[PDB]
Design a protein around this ligand. Structure first.
Ligand SMILES: CCO/N=C/c1ccc(OCC[C@@H](C)CCN2CCN(c3ccncc3)C2=O)cc1
Ligand SMILES: CCO/N=C/c1ccc(OCC[C@@H](C)CCN2CCN(c3ccncc3)C2=O)cc1
Ligand SMILES: N[C@@H](CCC(=O)N[C@@H](CS)C(=O)NCC(=O)O)C(=O)O
Ligand SMILES: N[C@@H](CCC(=O)N[C@@H](CS)C(=O)NCC(=O)O)C(=O)O
Lengths: 281, 58, 286, 281, 286, 68
C-alpha cells in the first residue's frame, strides 16, 4: 500500500572494482537507478517515511471552485426581467484544477459537487424580504432549455433538480463516470468533420481540438420566490471534488498563462524564467 | 441529437432492375417502411423531451 | 452490515450507487514484410510505456462486423523525405497516422474504411564523422496539440494546415502573431523552447524519447503502441501520435561555418486493422 | 434482473443456403427477430451494456410538479377576506407527467408527495411579519369542505393534516394505492348514466369519459397565523413521485397539444411534422 | 433487523406500511356453436397479448350471486353489414360490445343483466383479383376514445352519437369544428392520420393488428380477450374494445377510375357471462 | 444492359471486369501475382406474359477472333 515505508539504507565500506555504476549512457532513454550506497560510504538507517500523501487519490482530494453563477430577484415596482443563470459544465473556467488535471492525458473519476449560496441587498431602502429558495436544474444535451424563469421546463418531470433553502447547509450531490468513451480526454488532436473536395469549403469547416466527447449539458439556476419590492442579488459558487480517480499518460505542466480553452498562448506572456548568473549560488 | 462526432451514416434505395407489369395492370404502386431495434439495443441518461409543451396551467 | 478497518474504525454504505461512497546493444536488425533495416551504432531501442502493439481483443471490441487485417501488405517500412540539419535549424514535427496517408496500400485501406487502429515502429537515421559534434532529441507525444498563430481567436487552425503529410512542419524560435483580419492564415506557430504547446522543453523527457549524440550513436528506434480513450477510431479525423525532433546541442564541424547533414525517417505500421467499408474518402488537402 | 448484460455477438462467416431469413411477411402481425449475424459477417464481441435504466421503475423515478397553489395573509387594516386554497387532486393540470403516464392504459403505484413553499411581501411598506405556519388538509369525497379560513372543519378529528413551519425542509408524505378498481384507468370509454326512453332527456345526460373512478378528494391549504398589518403572499408547489409502479396495455404517445382533460384536440395545432425532401439526407 | 444488499450496503424499514418504503398458414377453419368459417388465403391469426379468452375465476370474482353462461346460444358468429371500399375511403370504426347489441340472444342477455363480460373473435373479409392493389390495416384498441367536434367544450359527445351500433362510423381527412351554439351536434370528429385521438397513425402498430394486402391474403383474424381494470362491468355503459380499419395504400384496379370492393365483418363472443338479473333496459338510442 | 428483339448477346472477361472495384482492383494493380475464384449472379425478371430464354456460359480461356 501507499503507506508502506520506503527501503532502508544499507551500510557500505570502501570499494575497489572494475564495475562502474556511475558512468552510464542517457542516449538509450532510461534513467540510472543509483542509490547513495553506490558512491559514498553509508551507515544503516531504518526508514520510517512513506509516500501515502502523494498518491493520485490524495493529490486530488480537495474541493476546487469551478464557477460562480449570478441570479437576482428584482423589485416589484420595475420592468426588469427576472434573471436566471445558465452555465455550461466544464472545469476550464478556472486555472488551478485545470493545471492539476492536465498533468495527464486521460482520466476516469466520479464527481462530487457542492454549492455555496450568498445573497445581499442592492438598494439603501430599508425594505425587507422573506427567506428565498433556489432551484438548480441539470439539462442534458438535447433537452429543452428554459427561456423564462417560470416556463414549463422547470416542471422537471425527468431532469434532476435541487431545491435549496437559504441559510441552511451548502448543497451537495455526487455523480458517477458519465463519459461516452472509456476515459475522459483532456486533449484531443483532431477535428469533428473531414472536408470533402466535392462539397463547399464552409460545409466541412470545424474548430481544432473540439469534439462532442466534452458535451455534458448545462446547469440552470433560478430563484423560486416571486419578486419583492426590493431587489436581492445572489451568487452561487460551485466546488468540484473528483474521487475514485485514475489517470494515464503524464505530461509536462503548463508554464505560461492559459489563453482560451485550447493550448494557445498569448504574446507578451512567454518569459516564465528569471535571471540568475551561471557561477552564482 | 444532430452531431458530427457521432454521426451514424446513410441509407438509400435503388432499382436493381426495373419494375415490370403486363397489360391491364396499374403502372404505379407504393411501398411502406418500418423501423425497429434489435435485442442488443440500450439507452441511458433519462432527460426531458421537446415533443410536448405548455403555456397556461390546466 | 458494517466494515471495520484500521487507522480501528467502522464505515457503512448508505446508498445503492458506488458513486455515493466516500473515497551487443550497438547492433540491430528489423524485418517487416519485404523490408529490412540494419544498424551498427545504436543505443538500444525504446518501447513506449513498456507495451508492445497488439490486436483488438473480443472483450474490448465496440463494432460488430468483421475487421480487415492487411498484414504484410501494409505492415512494412515506409521511408519519408529527408531533411537537412544545419546550424540554423530549430526542429521538425510529424503527425501519425497523418504522415502515411499516401503510402501504398496502407493509405488505400485508411481512406476506404471508417474506423482503424495501429501501432508504429519509428527509425530515425543520422550519421556524421568523428569530427562532428551535436545532439538531437526525438520525442513521441500522445495527443500532440500545437498552438495557433492568432491572438484574436483560438482553435482556428484549418484542417489543411494541421495535416501537412509526409513533409511535416518546423518549429520557430519566436512567436509572430498574424494580423490579417481579412485573410487569416489559420496555421500553427510552434515555438521550440515551449515545445509548441506552452510547456517547457526541458520537461519533454516525460514523454517516450531518445537522444542521438553524434559521438555515441547514429540512429534511434521507438516502438509505439496504440493509445487512445477509445478501442478504435477514425484515422482521417484524429491523429494519435506526434513525432518531434529538436537540436539539443547545435551542429558543428571542425572550423567550417556552414556544415550540413541529412536526417531520414522510416516508419512501419504494426497490427493495423480496419472496420466500416464504404466508398473512398476524397479529402480537401489543398 | 434488469442489470443483466445483453447477449454477446457471434462470429459468422460466408453462407450459401436455401433458407431466407431476410424475406418475411408483415401481414401476419409479427416482427422479424433478426440479428446482425443473419445478413453480414460479424466478429465475436463480449457485451457489457445493460437495460437497467429503461425499466418501468427507473422511467418514473423523478418528482414532477403537478400544481401550484396560492394563499395569502392580508393586512389587518383592510376588509379583504383571508384567502385559502382548494385543489382537486389530479395529474392532468400539467403535461410532462401526463404524457409519460399515458404511454399505457392501466397502472398501479404508490405515491410520494413533496411540498415546496415560498413567500413574499406585496407592498413597499417596511412593515414586518413573524414566521408563518401552514395547514394542509386532505378532504376525501363526502367530507365537509371548509368555507371560511377558521371554521370548525379545520379541527381535523379524522382528516389527516400537515402543519408546516416556513423556512424548514420541504414537507413530504407517502400514500398507498387507493383505487376502488384493481388498477388506475388512464382512459375510460363510456358514460356514467344510461339514458332511458321513459325518462326525460336531461335526466340521462352525462359527460363522455367521466366516471367516479377518478374522484380522490381535495387538498385545502391555509395560513394558520392571524393577519399582520402587511400582506404576505405564498405559493406552494406540489411534486408527485410514483413508486412500486406497474403498467398495462401500451399506447402511442400524444403528438399534438393537450386540450382539456380528454383526448380532444384544438384546430390550428394538428401539424406536428416539418418539411423534408424525399431524396435528401 | 437489517437487510444487506450489493451495489454492499444496508437498509432498514422504519414504518409499518410498505408505502413508506423507499423503492398451412393459408388455410383456416373456425367453428362456434352452429356457425363455421373457412379461409384459403390467410396470414395466420393474432391472439392479442398472447392471452386466450377464459371464464372468471373464484379468486377474482366480485359479485356473489350465480352467473349466467348462455354458451352456444350466444357464443356464435354474427355478420354485421358490408361496407364499400373505394378510392375516396378514409376508414371505419366499431365499438365492442356496442356492435352486438341487437344480435340474437346475446343482446337480450346484455340488456337483461346488470354486469357482463366476454372476449371476441373478429374476422374481416375482403377479396379481389390478381390485378387489384391495395392494403388495409386492422387495429384493435382497448379503450378507444375519440375526439369531439367542438372547440368551445370538451367531452360533450352525446350517448347516442357515441354508440352507432352495427353500422359504425367513419374517419375523415380534415377537422371541421362545429359552430352551432344553439343546437350543438355533439358528435365525434375523428381524423385518420391522428387515429382520431391525437396520436400519429404510424405508431398504431403498438396495438394488436393485422394487415390485409390484396396480393397476399384476403382475410384477417383477431382473437381478443377481456381487458378492463375490473373483473366484470356494465356492458351498456362502457365499451371495452374498438375496431379500426384504415386504407394504408389506396385501392387501384387496372385503369378504371372508380373501382370498388366490399368488406365484411363477422364477430363471435367467447366465454361470455352475466350477473344481476332484473327487468330489461330500454335505452334512448335515437 | 438492355435486352430487346435485336440483341445478339454480351460478353465479359474475368478478372478484367473487376479492375476498378474497391480494394480488389487496388490489390490487383499493386501486386505481381494473384489468384481467385468467383460467384456470378445474373438477374432478369419479366411478367407471366413475356416469353424468351437466355443461355449463360462460363468459358475457360475464352479467346475471340479478330476483324482482319
Ligand atoms: C440538479 C443537480 O443535479 N446535477 C446533476 C449533474 C449530472 C451530471 C453532470 O455532469 C458532469 C459532467 C462532468 C463529470 C464532466 C467533467 N469533465 C470531464 C472532462 N472534462 C473536459 C471538459 C473540456 N475539455 C476537456 C475535458 C470535463 O469537463 C453535472 C450535474
Ligand atoms: C394532509 C396530507 O395528507 N395527504 C393525504 C393524501 C391522501 C390521498 C391522496 O389521494 C391520492 C390520489 C392519487 C393517488 C390519484 C392519482 N391518479 C391516479 C389516476 N388518476 C387519474 C386522474 C384523472 N383521470 C385519470 C386518472 C389520478 O389522478 C392525496 C393526499
Ligand atoms: N407565466 C404564468 C406563470 C408561469 C406558470 O404558471 N407556468 C406553469 C405552466 S407554463 C409551469 O409549468 N410553471 C413551472 C414552475 O414554475 O414550476 C403567469 O402568467 O403567471
Ligand atoms: N370565527 C371565530 C374564530 C374561529 C374559531 O374559533 N373557530 C373554532 C370553532 S368554529 C374552531 O373550531 N376553529 C378551528 C381552528 O381554526 O383550528 C371568531 O369570531 O373568532
Amino acid at each position: 500500500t501507499s503507506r508502506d515505508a520506503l527501503p532502508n539504507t544499507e551500510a557500505s565500506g570502501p570499494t575497489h572494482s572494475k564495475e562502474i555504476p556511475a558512468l552510464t549512457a542517457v542516449e538509450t532513454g532510461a534513467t540510472n537507478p543509483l542509490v547513495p550506497s553506490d558512491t559514498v560510504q553509508t551507515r544503516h538507517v531504518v526508514q520510517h517515511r512513506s509516500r501515502s500523501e502523494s498518491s493520485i487519490e490524495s493529490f486530488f482530494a480537495r474541493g476546487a471552485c469551478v464557477t460562480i453563477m449570478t441570479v437576482d430577484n428584482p423589485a416589484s415596482t420595475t420592468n426588469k426581467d427576472k434573471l436566471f443563470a445558465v452555465w455550461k459544465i466544464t472545469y476550464k473556467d478556472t486555472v488551478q484544477l485545470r493545471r492539476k488535471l492536465e498533468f495527464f492525458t486521460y482520466s476516469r473519476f466520479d464527481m462530487e459537487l457542492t454549492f455555496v449560496v450568498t445573497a445581499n441587498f442592492t438598494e439603501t431602502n430599508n425594505g425587507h424580504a422573506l427567506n428565498q429558495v433556489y432551484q438548480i436544474m441539470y439539462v442534458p444535451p438535447g433537452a429543452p432549455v428554459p427561456e423564462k424563469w417560470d416556463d414549463y421546463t422547470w416542471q422537471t418531470s425527468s431532469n434532476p433538480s435541487i431545491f435549496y433553502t437559504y441559510g441552511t447547509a451548502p448543497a451537495r450531490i455526487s455523480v458517477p463516470y458519465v463519459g461516452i468513451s472509456n476515459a475522459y480526454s483532456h486533449f484531443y488532436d483532431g477535428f469533428s468533420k473531414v472536408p470533402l473536395k466535392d462539397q463547399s469549403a464552409a460545409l466541412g469547416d470545424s474548430l481544432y481540438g473540439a469534439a462532442s466527447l466534452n458535451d455534458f449539458g448545462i446547469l440552470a439556476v433560478r430563484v423560486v420566490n416571486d419578486p419583492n419590492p426590493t431587489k436581492v442579488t445572489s451568487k452561487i459558487r460551485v466546488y468540484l471534488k473528483p474521487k475514485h480517480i485514475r489517470v494515464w499518460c503524464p505530461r509536462p505542466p503548463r508554464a505560461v498563462a492559459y489563453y482560451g480553452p485550447g493550448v494557445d498562448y498569448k504574446d507578451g506572456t512567454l518569459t516564465p524564467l528569471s535571471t540568475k548568473d551561471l557561477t552564482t549560488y | 441529437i444532430d452531431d458530427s462526432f457521432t454521426e451514424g451514416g446513410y441509407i438509400s434505395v435503388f432499382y436493381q432492375t426495373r419494375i415490370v407489369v403486363p397489360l391491364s395492370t396499374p403502372r404505379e404502386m407504393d411501398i411502406l417502411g418500418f423501423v425497429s431495434a434489435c435485442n442488443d439495443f440500450s439507452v441511458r441518461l433519462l432527460r426531458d423531451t421537446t415533443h410536448i409543451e405548455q403555456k397556461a396551467l390546466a | 452490515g458494517a466494515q471495520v478497518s484500521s487507522q480501528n474504525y467502522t464505515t457503512i454504505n448508505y446508498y445503492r450507487d458506488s458513486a455515493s461512497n466516500a473515497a551487443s546493444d550497438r547492433v540491430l536488425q528489423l524485418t517487416l514484410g519485404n523490408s529490412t533495416i540494419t544498424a551498427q551504432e545504436a543505443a538500444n531501442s525504446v518501447v513506449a510505456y513498456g507495451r508492445w502493439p497488439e490486436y483488438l481483443r473480443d472483450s474490448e471490441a465496440n463494432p460488430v462486423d468483421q475487421p480487415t487485417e492487411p498484414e504484410v501488405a501494409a505492415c512494412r517500412f515506409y521511408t519519408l523525405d529527408t531533411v537537412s540539419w544545419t546550424k540554423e535549424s530549430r526542429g521538425w514535427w510529424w503527425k501519425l497516422p497523418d504522415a502515411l496517408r499516401d503510402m501504398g496500400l496502407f493509405g488505400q485501406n485508411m481512406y476506404y474504411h471508417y474506423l482503424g487502429r495501429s501501432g508504429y515502429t519509428v527509425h530515425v537515421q543520422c550519421n556524421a564523422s568523428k569530427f562532428h559534434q551535436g545532439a538531437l532529441g526525438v520525442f513521441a507525444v500522445p495527443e500532440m496539440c500545437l498552438a495557433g498563430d492568432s491572438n484574436t481567436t483560438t482553435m482556428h487552425t484549418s484542417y489543411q494546415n494541421a495535416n501537412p503529410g509526409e513533409k511535416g512542419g518546423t518549429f520557430t524560435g519566436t512567436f509572430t502573431p498574424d494580423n490579417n483580419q481579412t485573410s487569416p492564415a489559420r496555421r500553427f506557430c510552434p515555438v521550440d523552447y515551449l515545445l509548441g504547446n506552452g510547456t517547457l522543453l526541458g520537461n519533454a523527457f516525460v514523454f517516450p524519447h531518445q537522444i542521438i549524440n553524434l559521438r555515441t550513436n547514429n540512429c534511434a528506434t521507438l516502438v509505439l503502441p496504440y493509445v487512445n480513450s477509445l478501442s478504435i477510431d477514425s484515422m482521417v479525423k484524429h491523429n494519435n501520435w506526434g513525432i518531434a525532433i529538436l537540436p539539443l546541442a547545435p551542429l558543428n564541424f571542425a572550423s567550417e561555418s556552414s556544415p550540413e547533414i541529412p536526417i531520414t525517417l522510416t516508419i512501419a505500421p504494426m497490427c493495423c486493422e480496419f472496420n466500416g467499408l464504404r466508398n473512398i474518402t476524397l479529402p480537401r488537402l489543398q
